[PDB]
Amino acid sequence: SGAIYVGNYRVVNRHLATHNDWANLVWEDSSRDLLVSSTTAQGCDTIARCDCQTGVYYCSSRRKHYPVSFSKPSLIFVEASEYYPARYQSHLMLAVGHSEPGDCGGILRCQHGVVGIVSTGGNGLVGFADVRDLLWLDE
Ligand SMILES: COc1cc(Cl)ccc1CC(=O)N1CCC[C@H](C(N)=O)C1
Ligand SMILES: [Zn+2]
């Protein structure tokens, strides 16, 4: 679990969104595993606007932050689950690192702010759903 709170928005993994998130839906994209819902209170998380390929992510399964090098946002094949059939997930970035299913939602950050959230993993790899292209999160 885990979410990004910026302005009047909440960004979460689409597969972990709540009834409240869906009743306050702003935008969702199955192909990216993202859902954005509206909030009454303000969020102060700074979203990075950069092409950083290094950063730090939070791993709840280890109660630790890990530094990682990560790939450019791209279309990567992701195997089936109780949430999705097997498909290409877009805007996905991989790093060599530890993750487990309950790690989805952990934030990846660079020196410029929030880059994205944990969305996939397996085989010593961890995948992050990029959010740096969602320019409207600030305005
Ligand atoms: C961090 O997630 C891990 C990690 C490991 Cl090692 C093993 C399994 C998972 C879970 C995972 O990748 N899923 C299930 C939830 C939806 C995801 C998606 N974006 O399509 C795919
Ligand atoms: Zn950056």
From Swiss-Prot:
Zn(2+) 1 binds at residues 50, 52, 110, 112. It catalyses: Selective cleavage of Tyr-|-Gly bond in the picornavirus polyprotein. The active site is at residues 15, 33, 104. It comes from the Viruses. Cysteine protease that cleaves viral polyprotein and specific host proteins. It is responsible for the autocatalytic cleavage between the P1 and P2 regions, which is the first cleavage occurring in the polyprotein. Also cleaves the host translation initiation factor EIF4G1, in order to shut down the capped cellular mRNA translation. Inhibits the host nucleus-cytoplasm protein and RNA trafficking by cleaving host members of the nuclear pores. Counteracts stress granule formation probably by antagonizing its assembly or promoting its dissassembly. Homodimer. This is Protease 2A. It comes from Coxsackievirus A16 (strain G-10). The lineage of its organism: Viruses, Riboviria, Orthornavirae, Pisuviricota, Pisoniviricetes. The chain holds residues 869 to 1007 of 2193 of the full protein.
